[PDB]
Write a protein that binds this ligand. Sequence first.
Ligand SMILES: *[C@@H]1O[C@H](CO)[C@@H](O[C@@H]2O[C@H](CO)[C@@H](O[C@H]3O[C@H](CO)[C@@H](O)[C@H](O)[C@@H]3O)[C@H](O)[C@H]2NC(C)=O)[C@H](O)[C@H]1NC(C)=O
Ligand SMILES: *[C@@H]1O[C@H](CO)[C@@H](O[C@@H]2O[C@H](CO)[C@@H](O[C@H]3O[C@H](CO)[C@@H](O)[C@H](O)[C@@H]3O)[C@H](O)[C@H]2NC(C)=O)[C@H](O)[C@H]1NC(C)=O
Ligand SMILES: *[C@@H]1O[C@H](CO)[C@@H](O[C@@H]2O[C@H](CO)[C@@H](O)[C@H](O)[C@H]2NC(C)=O)[C@H](O)[C@H]1NC(C)=O
Ligand SMILES: *[C@@H]1O[C@H](CO)[C@@H](O[C@@H]2O[C@H](CO)[C@@H](O)[C@H](O)[C@H]2NC(C)=O)[C@H](O)[C@H]1NC(C)=O
Ligand SMILES: *[C@@H]1O[C@H](CO)[C@@H](O[C@@H]2O[C@H](CO)[C@@H](O)[C@H](O)[C@H]2NC(C)=O)[C@H](O)[C@H]1NC(C)=O
Ligand code: NAG
Lengths: 167, 168
Amino acid sequence: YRHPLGCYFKGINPTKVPSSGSHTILKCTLPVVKVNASWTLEWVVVKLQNSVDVTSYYESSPNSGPTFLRAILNFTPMHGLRTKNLLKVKDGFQVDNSTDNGNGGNLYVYPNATTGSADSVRCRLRMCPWTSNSKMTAPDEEMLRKMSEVLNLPNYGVPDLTPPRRD
Amino acid sequence: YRHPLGCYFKGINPTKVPSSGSHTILKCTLPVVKVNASWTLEWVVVKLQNSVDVTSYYESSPNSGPTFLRAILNFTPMHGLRTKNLLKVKDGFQVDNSTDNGNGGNLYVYPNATTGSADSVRCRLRMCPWTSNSKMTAPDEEMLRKMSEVLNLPNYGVPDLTPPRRDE
Ligand SMILES: *[C@@H]1O[C@H](CO)[C@@H](O[C@@H]2O[C@H](CO)[C@@H](O[C@H]3O[C@H](CO)[C@@H](O)[C@H](O)[C@@H]3O)[C@H](O)[C@H]2NC(C)=O)[C@H](O)[C@H]1NC(C)=O
Ligand SMILES: *[C@@H]1O[C@H](CO)[C@@H](O[C@@H]2O[C@H](CO)[C@@H](O[C@H]3O[C@H](CO)[C@@H](O)[C@H](O)[C@@H]3O)[C@H](O)[C@H]2NC(C)=O)[C@H](O)[C@H]1NC(C)=O
Ligand SMILES: *[C@@H]1O[C@H](CO)[C@@H](O[C@@H]2O[C@H](CO)[C@@H](O)[C@H](O)[C@H]2NC(C)=O)[C@H](O)[C@H]1NC(C)=O
Ligand SMILES: *[C@@H]1O[C@H](CO)[C@@H](O[C@@H]2O[C@H](CO)[C@@H](O)[C@H](O)[C@H]2NC(C)=O)[C@H](O)[C@H]1NC(C)=O
Ligand SMILES: *[C@@H]1O[C@H](CO)[C@@H](O[C@@H]2O[C@H](CO)[C@@H](O)[C@H](O)[C@H]2NC(C)=O)[C@H](O)[C@H]1NC(C)=O
Ligand SMILES: *[C@@H]1O[C@H](CO)[C@@H](O)[C@H](O)[C@H]1NC(C)=O
């Protein structure tokens, strides 16, 4: 099946996509890496010290780079801790879930959101490679070669607790 | 009997323990955390880009903070150096295996060691909590509250690739 190899927690600065409406469309350009992996980028609004309710989920293959699939719910936010509630459409933040239109999973920052939370947004990419090999415990040398662009990104919120290995 | 929850790789600066002896005694003050955990601090000698052959092993309970048990061998060193190359008693480095009375597991830096080695020493604490609950995959909120002092320590040698959790 798809045996996980680990997760990379990197930070990407969003790029403004010129829009037709009054809203701000933000895109976090993902490196075109052709390896078996899952890409979950969390939209962190630094100014409000909170995150958006849903995260953009992408998937990569050995013959295709990260391609958008769906906008899954944010289960483990960077801040959270029940001190505050995640930012929703009501708060002026929405991720489009369209696969037909060229957008997705780009963040929509409507004028309804705090002035100016859009410029404060930062991505927390959770790149998690996998392999068909059950005997592989970490990414091999040629896989780390292909993932160079992701590996060279700055670390963002990488946890202190290293999970235990299968015993 | 004791299910692991993970490991914290933190750095601690050693404190010089006064002694009327020619040797230097270094202590890495561990936070008094009352949780079920194992504490393995590695004595890294930064100047020589090497570590000491043995590590001080401590154990904590919900009724007692980290208490020293024994000086176990360094299996996974920092600089990736092969075992046998690690700084031994011959090189002027020794960890006290004494349970009674005190001064264990404190590092002894004898005068025959390279000048400036003692001041260069840094600890690599490997704090690994463990629960009796088989259905617990990560430390709970009240456990992370108690481990605040360890969590606020600076990271030291923790890898960039986070291994996958108990899933597949
Ligand atoms: C990248 O991930 C792919 C899964 O998303 C994976 O492809 C799958 O590989 C398996 C074999 O590992 C194929 O299944 C074949 O294996 C059985 C025995 O278990 C044979 O009897 C059959 O030939 C069977 O088809 C899947 O067909 C395949 N799935 C698809 C369509 O992708 C890749 O192997 C992964 N690549 C790397 C390099 O990690
Ligand atoms: C902290 O770790 C302890 C283990 O190092 C653990 O204590 C052990 O808990 C089990 C039950 O979960 C006890 O039960 C066993 O022994 C009794 C007789 O004493 C039998 O009746 C039981 O059937 C079973 O075999 C152990 O006695 C106990 N061991 C000791 C002495 O510590 C704690 O539960 C852990 N605490 C937390 C909060 O994580
Ligand atoms: C984004 O769109 C997909 C549809 O492609 C949604 O996925 C559905 O999820 C529900 C359960 O939550 C299932 O009942 C459906 O079968 C799924 N559809 C399929 C076939 O993929 C997804 O929930 C949407 N995300 C958002 C923004 O809520
Ligand atoms: C702030 O603005 C957005 C739109 O600019 C609002 O979102 C819409 O909410 C209505 C509720 O009736 C829904 O029908 C739409 O699906 C939402 N629009 C889209 C496509 O995003 C949001 O409710 C506003 N928040 C405030 C302050 O009321
Ligand atoms: C450096 O000095 C220490 C003592 O100051 C030496 O350690 C002793 O080595 C002998 C080997 O026969 C043993 O009896 C003991 O394990 C050591 N004594 C203690 C308790 O420290 C060490 O051998 C010296 N290294 C050099 C350069 O010869
Ligand atoms: C320290 O003492 C313990 C006693 O349990 C012993 O098992 C161990 O071999 C000693 N450590 C070393 C390697 O000197």
